[PDB]
Amino acid sequence: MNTVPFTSAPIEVTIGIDQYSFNVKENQPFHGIKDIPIGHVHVIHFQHADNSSMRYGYWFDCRMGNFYIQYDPKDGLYKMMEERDGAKFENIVHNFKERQMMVSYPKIDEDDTWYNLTEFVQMDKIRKIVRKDENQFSYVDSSMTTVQENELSDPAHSLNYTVINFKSREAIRPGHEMEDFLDKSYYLNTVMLQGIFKNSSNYFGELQFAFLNAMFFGNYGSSLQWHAMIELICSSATVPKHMLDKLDEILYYQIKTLPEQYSDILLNERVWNICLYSSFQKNSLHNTEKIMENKYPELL
Amino acid sequence: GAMNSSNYAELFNNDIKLFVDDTNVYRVTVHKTFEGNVATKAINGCIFTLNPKTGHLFLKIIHTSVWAGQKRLSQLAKWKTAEEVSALVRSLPKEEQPKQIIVTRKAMLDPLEVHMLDFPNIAIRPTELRLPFSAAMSIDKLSDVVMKATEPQMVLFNIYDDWLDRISSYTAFSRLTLLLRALKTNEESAKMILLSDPTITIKSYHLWPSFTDEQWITIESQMRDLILTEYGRKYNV
Numbered sequence: 001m002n003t004v005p006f007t008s009a010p011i012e013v014t015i016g017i018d019q020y021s022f023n024v025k026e027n028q029p030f031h032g033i034k035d036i037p038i039g040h041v042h043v044i045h046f047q048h049a050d051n052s053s054m055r056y057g058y059w060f061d062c063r064m065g066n067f068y069i070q071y072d073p074k075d076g077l078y079k080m081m082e083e084r085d086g087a088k089f090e091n092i093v094h095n096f097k098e099r100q101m102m103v104s105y106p107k108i109d110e111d112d113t114w115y116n117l118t119e120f121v122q123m124d125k126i127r128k129i130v131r132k133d134e135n136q137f138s139y140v141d142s143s144m145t146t147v148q149e150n151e152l153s154d155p156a157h158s159l160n161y162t163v164i165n166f167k168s169r170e171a172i173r174p175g176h177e178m179e180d181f182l183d184k185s186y187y188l189n190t191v192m193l194q195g196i197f198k199n200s201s202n203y204f205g206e207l208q209f210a211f212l213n214a215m216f217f218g219n220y221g222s223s224l225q226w227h228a229m230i231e232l233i234c235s236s237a238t239v240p241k242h243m244l245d246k247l248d249e250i251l252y253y254q255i256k257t258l259p260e261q262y263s264d265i266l267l268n269e270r271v272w273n274i275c276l277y278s279s280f281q282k283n284s285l286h287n288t289e290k291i292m293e294n295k296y297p298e299l300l
Numbered sequence: 301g302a303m304n305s306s307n308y309a310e311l312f313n314n315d316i317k318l319f320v321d322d323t324n325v326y327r328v329t330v331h332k333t334f335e336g337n338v339a340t341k342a343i344n345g346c347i348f349t350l351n352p353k354t355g356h357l358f359l360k361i362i363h364t365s366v367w368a369g370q371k372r373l374s375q376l377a378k379w380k381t382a383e384e385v386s387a388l389v390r391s392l393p394k395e396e397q398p399k400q401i402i403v404t405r406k407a408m409l410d411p412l413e414v415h416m417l418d419f420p421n422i423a424i425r426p427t428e429l430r431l432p433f434s435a436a437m438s439i440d441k442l443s444d445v446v447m448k449a450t451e452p453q454m455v456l457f458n459i460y461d462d463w464l465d466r467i468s469s470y471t472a473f474s475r476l477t478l479l480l481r482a483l484k485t486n487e488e489s490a491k492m493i494l495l496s497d498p499t500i501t502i503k504s505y506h507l508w509p510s511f512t513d514e515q516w517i518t519i520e521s522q523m524r525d526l527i528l529t530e531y532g533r534k535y536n537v
């Protein structure tokens with residue numbers, strides 16, 4: 001069980017760790033988060049009490065280094081850093097742990113939610129979507145735009161999701177215009193899966209990461225990417241049986257976790273109605289359709 | 301964006317553009333079968349592709365064989381229309397290719413956009429105008445070449461005849477849409493008006509009769525009366 005120690009909490013802030021969150025008061029003696037499950041990526045995220053503008057946070061994997069959080073009064077945010085001195089890090093954390101100044105990652109033993117939301121998410125792939133190679137962790141916030149959004153303006157601060165565009169030469173084979181537009185299987189299976197992602201795990205990992213950025217930061221381009229990757233599968237007539245079954249599980253846990261009050265902004269009525277009721281895969285997402293109908297029947 | 305009453309003069313500026321109407325691409329007669337079920341029989345159709353500035357009409361005849369063994373023909377018809385318009389554009393020299401294509405029905409937007417991906421600089425636009433181009437098959441010479449076709453064929457016409465020698469494009473389009481609106485509202489009356497005086501004929505190389513300027517004013521007045529009448533006969537006013 002790993003630990004992300006905190007130098008201090010100089011400003012009042014709501015701190016998130018994965019799907020959990022807690023309020024820290026200005027100058028409260030808070031010194032970090034312990035008992036973080038090894039084996040998963042994680043996200044530690046922030047919303048200042050005085051400016052609920054800019055949710056922001058850091059994707060990390062404790063297997064890749066020792067990370068700590070310290071507030072920067074110049075840039076005005078909680079920053080993640082890597083401490084290379086492993087002895088300095090054990091000493092800082094043991095001191096903090098002995099004085100019980102850390103919150104414990106509050107995982108219920110029965111509860112597979114985080115695993116289920118991050119099953120295919122890999123740190124190495126996050127670091128290719130979020131480019132900042134000198135760090136092992138990845139910063140994301142509410143305002144960062146995607147490469148695709150930029151085409152339609154600072155490239156260093158962009159989310160390099162895989163561009164999906166249903167009315168593009170990449171998606172449409174010359175001579176198969178109607179076929180490829182109405183049945184996107186060649187775009188899904190040859191262009192994206194075989195060509196770009198290489199396998200369905202990487203595709204699902206980017207899908208899951210886009211959802212999590214949409215949910216935790218309200219990042220609009222991430223929500224667009226999540227919906228596009230759903231729609232490309234549902235709009236394909238020929239999808240491996242194992243991908244459909246896995247997609248149903250993936251979406252079920254995403255819909256289950258979504259705050260009830262954010263459905264209005266984070267769920268695209270057109271895509272969901274198309275995917276559940278009109279698409280080729282309208283009958284292949286039983287778990288997702290059941291939770292959607294019982295939780296958000298208005299959207300439908 | 302969409303074409304409407306506000307940007308109407310844009311049709312007659314010097315940027316090449318084409319209207320595309322797909323109404324008459326997929327045409328059927330509905331009939332009873334011996335078992336007393338209903339069935340359709342396709343008849344020849346046509347794409348109505350028109351330069352509103354010059355009058356040049358690219359009438360692509362859609363022969364019934366194109367539907368043989370196909371499913372969901374009304375959907376296919378939009379994609380076939382888009383395939384043929386894209387083929388037409390590619391067939392034209394660069395300096396004749398349109399800068400905009402305006403579709404008369406919004407269901408043509410995605411089919412045409414997808415077929416024209418190779419031409420990102422050609423704008424595909426809808427329109428809020430309710431244009432009467434469905435009535436093209438009420439023009440006898442257009443109907444005749446469509447019905448007589450035994451294979452796919454493209455036929456070229458000027459739908460303004462020689463009117464541009466005497467009137468502007470704006471006025472020529474206004475006359476065309478008035479004639480077509482009349483033909484659509486009451487075809488029989490409309491055609492009676494156009495031919496009632498047998499001394500006025502249709503030249504072999506023309507579609508409409510050879511009216512003088514004064515005779516066109518009388519004709520156009522008779523078409524308006526017809527349209528208003530029918531509007532009354534319809535709603536009772």
Ligand SMILES: COC(=O)CNc1ccc(OC(F)F)c(Cl)c1
Nearest residue numbers: 005006007008068069083089092
């Ligand atoms: C730049 O001067 C430094 O001392 C950086 N080293 C440092 C500071 C604080 C740490 O824990 C903090 F979380 F409580 C750690 Cl683990 C390392």
